[PDB]
Amino acid sequence: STEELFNEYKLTRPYMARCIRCAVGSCHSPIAIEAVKSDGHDGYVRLQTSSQYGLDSSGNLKGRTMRYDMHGTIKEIPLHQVSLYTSRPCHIVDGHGYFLLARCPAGDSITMEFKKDSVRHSCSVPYEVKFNPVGRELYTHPPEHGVEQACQVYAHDAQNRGAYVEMHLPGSEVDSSLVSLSGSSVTVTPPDGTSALVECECGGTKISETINKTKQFSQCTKKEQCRAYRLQNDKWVYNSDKLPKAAGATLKGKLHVPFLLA
Amino acid sequence: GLDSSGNLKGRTMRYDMHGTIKEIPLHQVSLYTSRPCHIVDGHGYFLLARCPAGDSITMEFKKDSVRHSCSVPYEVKFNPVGRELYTHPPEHGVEQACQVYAHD
Amino acid sequence: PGAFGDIQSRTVSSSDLYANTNLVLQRPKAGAIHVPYTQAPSGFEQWKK
Amino acid sequence: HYKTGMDSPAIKCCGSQECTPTYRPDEQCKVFTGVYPFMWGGAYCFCDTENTQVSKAYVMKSDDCLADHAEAYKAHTASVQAFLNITVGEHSIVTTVY
Amino acid sequence: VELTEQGSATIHFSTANIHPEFRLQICTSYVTCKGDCHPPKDHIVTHPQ
Amino acid sequence: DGKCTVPLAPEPMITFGFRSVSLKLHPKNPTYLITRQLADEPHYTHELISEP
Amino acid sequence: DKAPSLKFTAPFGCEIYTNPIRAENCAVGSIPLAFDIPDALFTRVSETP
Amino acid sequence: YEHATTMPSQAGISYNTIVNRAGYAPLPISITPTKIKLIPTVNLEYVTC
Numbered sequence: 001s002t003e004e005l006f007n008e009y010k011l012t013r014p015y016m017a018r019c020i021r022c023a024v025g026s027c028h029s030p031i032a033i034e035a036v037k038s039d040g041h042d043g044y045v046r047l048q049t050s051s052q053y054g055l056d057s058s059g060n061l062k063g064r065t066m067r068y069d070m071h072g073t074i075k076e077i078p079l080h081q082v083s084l085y086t087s088r089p090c091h092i093v094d095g096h097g098y099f100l101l102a103r104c105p106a107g108d109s110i111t112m113e114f115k116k117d118s119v120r121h122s123c124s125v126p127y128e129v130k131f132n133p134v135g136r137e138l139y140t141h142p143p144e145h146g147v148e149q150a151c152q153v154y155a156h157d158a159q160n161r162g163a164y165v166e167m168h169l170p171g172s173e174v175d176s177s178l179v180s181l182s183g184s185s186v187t188v189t190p191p192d193g194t195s196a197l198v199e200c201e202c203g204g205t206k207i208s209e210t211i212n213k214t215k216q217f218s219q220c221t222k223k224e225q226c227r228a229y230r231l232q233n234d235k236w237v238y239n240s241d242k243l244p245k246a247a248g249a250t251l252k253g254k255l256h257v258p259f260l261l262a
Numbered sequence: 263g264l265d266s267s268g269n270l271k272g273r274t275m276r277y278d279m280h281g282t283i284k285e286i287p288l289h290q291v292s293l294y295t296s297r298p299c300h301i302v303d304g305h306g307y308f309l310l311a312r313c314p315a316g317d318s319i320t321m322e323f324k325k326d327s328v329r330h331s332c333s334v335p336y337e338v339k340f341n342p343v344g345r346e347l348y349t350h351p352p353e354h355g356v357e358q359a360c361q362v363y364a365h366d
Numbered sequence: 367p368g369a370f371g372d373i374q375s376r377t378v379s380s381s382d383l384y385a386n387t388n389l390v391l392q393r394p395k396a397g398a399i400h401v402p403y404t405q406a407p408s409g410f411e412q413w414k415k
Numbered sequence: 416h417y418k419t420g421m422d423s424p425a426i427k428c429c430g431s432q433e434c435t436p437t438y439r440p441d442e443q444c445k446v447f448t449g450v451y452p453f454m455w456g457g458a459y460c461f462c463d464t465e466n467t468q469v470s471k472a473y474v475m476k477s478d479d480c481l482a483d484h485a486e487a488y489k490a491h492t493a494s495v496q497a498f499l500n501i502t503v504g505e506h507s508i509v510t511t512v513y
Numbered sequence: 514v515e516l517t518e519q520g521s522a523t524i525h526f527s528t529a530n531i532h533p534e535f536r537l538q539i540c541t542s543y544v545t546c547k548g549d550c551h552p553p554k555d556h557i558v559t560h561p562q
Numbered sequence: 563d564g565k566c567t568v569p570l571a572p573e574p575m576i577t578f579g580f581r582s583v584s585l586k587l588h589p590k591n592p593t594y595l596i597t598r599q600l601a602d603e604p605h606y607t608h609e610l611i612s613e614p
Numbered sequence: 615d616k617a618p619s620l621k622f623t624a625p626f627g628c629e630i631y632t633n634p635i636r637a638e639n640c641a642v643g644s645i646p647l648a649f650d651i652p653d654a655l656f657t658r659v660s661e662t663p
Numbered sequence: 664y665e666h667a668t669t670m671p672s673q674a675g676i677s678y679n680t681i682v683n684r685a686g687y688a689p690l691p692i693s694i695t696p697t698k699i700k701l702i703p704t705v706n707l708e709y710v711t712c
């Protein structure tokens with residue numbers, strides 16, 4: 001169990017990605033759904049999510065835990081606290097990496113939900129989920145008995161097969177909460193023990209990167225006048241299209257896809 | 263939108279119970295159609311929600327141990343915009359003029 | 367595009383891949399970081415149907 | 416089944432970018448100008464316009480192509496074979512005969 | 514069309530005649546202009562004739 | 563009134579022939595194809611297409 | 615049961631717009647023009663090449 | 664535009680032709696066969712030593 005998770009979670013960094021329908025309007029969800037694969041037969045789907053499964057916020061193996069990024073802070077929830085449904089409630093089978101194996105009915109969309117502190121985080125995406133019967137009898141719910149036939153299903157194993165996805169260097173993510181305002185002066189206080197690239201345009205242009213503790217850029221009057229991008233770039237992230245790209249050579253390894261069709 | 267006494271609150275449903283007036287936060291109030299709905303806001307007697315298509319609509323909450331539910335057979339419609347018939351709004355496309363129940 | 371063999375590989379393990387799916391990139395929605403694309407639905411799934 | 420892969424958008428604030436030559440299956444690249452990206456931590460660029468976003472996409476095989484694939488053959492010159500019990504004069508043999 | 518003391522002038526014209534022969538009028542002159550035309554590449558275009 | 567995002571159907575595959583246009587259509591959602599001649603008799607067609 | 619609007623079912627390629635209700639670029643008919651040109655613009659044969 | 668020709672099977676000798684549309688610039692075409700391979704479908708019967 002530990003050998004599978006080496007490259008997946010020694011270097012993990014779950015991310016926050018845009019969701020078009022997140023419990024009110026569209027926002028940036030911690031559980032944004034990237035892909036839903038439903039090519040198996042007996043209603044088994046393999047989701048790819050921005051959150052991560054099977055370990056805690058520190059990076060050590062845990063039984064059934066969904067781990068999500070919240071405004072830069074990596075947090076945890078039990079996997080039984082997460083709900084999934086296409087048209088009727090789904091039943092999560094397991095989770096591994098960015099991927100989640102669930103048993104879903106057919107539906108025109110898929111929705112993932114959970115409530116952590118007081119608010120309900122949801123993400124619904126319009127990815128059609130298909131139920132594919134096996135054989136020459138078009139059932140909708142698998143029978144209690146019959147005859148065994150060969151079929152392709154998304155297996156409940158997370159071993160390293162031949163399928164991989166890429167991990168990349170995360171791009172700098174702007175955080176406007178760092179930029180506070182002292183008396184007529186912007187002030188950037190990066191997160192404790194972390195750098196911050198303050199790209200600041202007012203009278204005189206400023207690209208001060210190496211700030212670590214606190215800086216006061218008195219040349220600039222209002223907070224909204226310039227940005228303070230957050231730099232960690234120590235844990236690498238999936239090559240999502242809902243994240244900015246980091247300049248230079250970005251590829252850093254391969255993540256094996258679990259729950260492959262078997 | 264405001265509590266039993268008559269003072270403004272953030273997201274609160276006020277309901278009559280056998281003559282005495284009670285309150286409950288809106289996140290304990292749920293409603294659904296064929297699939298679950300999502301409440302956007304509430305004001306006065308009116309509630310703005312985001313519902314999928316269905317032949318009826320049900321509204322539930324739970325106060326102490328009794329579930330208060332009310333289901334009515336009022337058809338709920340989903341109206342695609344444009345000339346492509348979708349059942350769930352797309353993640354991307356082109357901006358077209360439509361009419362929606364504004365959140366104000 | 368949209369028909370059997372829209373993507374083709376000489377063998378399963380071959381590094382070559384001929385793809386013709388009418389992949390077209392669209393303009394991103396205002397204030398959103400994503401890559402909107404449009405392409406013909408998979409021809410293998412359509413053939414299976 | 417194919418999988419449409421795609422790189423993270425490359426965003427430049429008060430700048431312009433150029434398309435990298437295509438080297439992957441069905442790769443498409445476009446530099447959309449006048450974008451105002453808006454991350455979870457507020458707006459990404461302090462720059463109202465002349466911001467560029469490079470978005471590119473391409474096609475790969477799905478992760479399940481090892482098992483869920485159909486292979487196309489060309490067939491010709493059939494070779495007939497038979498499995499026979501031959502019995503001649505109380506001498507018996509079960510064999511495959513081309 | 515601009516005109517000089519001596520030279521050649523080019524005029525772009527559109528005709529439906531396979532064998533055109535017209536009387537091109539210039540400042541005062543009436544030149545008789547003839548030739549042969551050939552079918553075009555495109556079966557369908559995006560502009561009216 | 564406001565603006566909302568509507569989908570964008572895959573680009574049709576157009577083949578030209580002598581006084582003929584062949585459209586190959588692969589929709590993702592049930593999509594409307596409307597058509598009319600630019601003449602005195604439009605002979606407009608209006609179809610809903612789900613399958614290729 | 616609306617049936618398609620006039621912008622989709624109008625003859626002669628008309629484009630229907632509202633506010634005000636109008637039809638644009640109808641390829642029908644012909645506009646007769648009457649010109650009254652002052653002699654100032656005209657030039658004698660000697661002046662022109 | 665569909666063109667058809669017949670190049671003799673002879674390695675190392677170029678074959679130059681031209682495509683002449685009715686009213687467009689001629690298109691030169693050249694085919695140079697460096698090797699022509701004929702590979703029969705062989706199945707092993709047995710091996711002797």
Ligand SMILES: *[C@@H]1O[C@H](CO)[C@@H](O)[C@H](O)[C@H]1NC(C)=O
Pocket residue numbers: 500509
């Ligand atoms: C032919 O071979 C099969 C396989 O051993 C056997 O079952 C069958 O009885 C044979 N028939 C005769 C006539 O020997």
Ligand SMILES: *[C@@H]1O[C@H](CO)[C@@H](O)[C@H](O)[C@H]1NC(C)=O
Pocket residue numbers: 577578579582584
């Ligand atoms: C007309 O449609 C048929 C099939 O309905 C198709 O085979 C043919 O190619 C089409 N015509 C042209 C000019 O492509």
